[PDB]
């Protein structure tokens, strides 16, 4: 906490709370595209996109 706690909030560390699937152990998924909770090629950040 001494060197990893920004006063305004350290958003550089991202913990994934919801995803399209569950990560395979020893598999580093760096998919930065939006996760889609429905079914469509989502372009903008909206509901289920």
């Amino acid at each position: 906490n001494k060197l990893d706690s920004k006063h305004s909030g350290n958003y550089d560390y991202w913990y994934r709370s919801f995803r399209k699937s569950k990560l395979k152990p020893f598999e580093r998924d760096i998919s930065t595209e939006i996760y889609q909770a429905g079914n469509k090629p989502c372009k903008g950040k909206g509901p289920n996109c």
Partner: protein, 48 residues
């Protein structure tokens, strides 16, 4: 899709039991501003 909704300080508690919970029906008319599921995966709601 209730005609009238209760106030926040008087939130109404509905009991759901002895039936199959189909969340696709909810998704059919869901303009989900917030869809935050805690403790249960939203994609795993159809098999639990």
């Amino acid at each position: 899709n209730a005609t009238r909704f209760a106030s926040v300080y008087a939130w109404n508690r509905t009991r759901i039991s002895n039936c199959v919970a189909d969340y696709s029906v909810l998704y059919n008319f869901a303009p989900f501003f917030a869809f935050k599921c805690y403790g249960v995966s939203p994609t795993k709601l159809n098999d639990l």
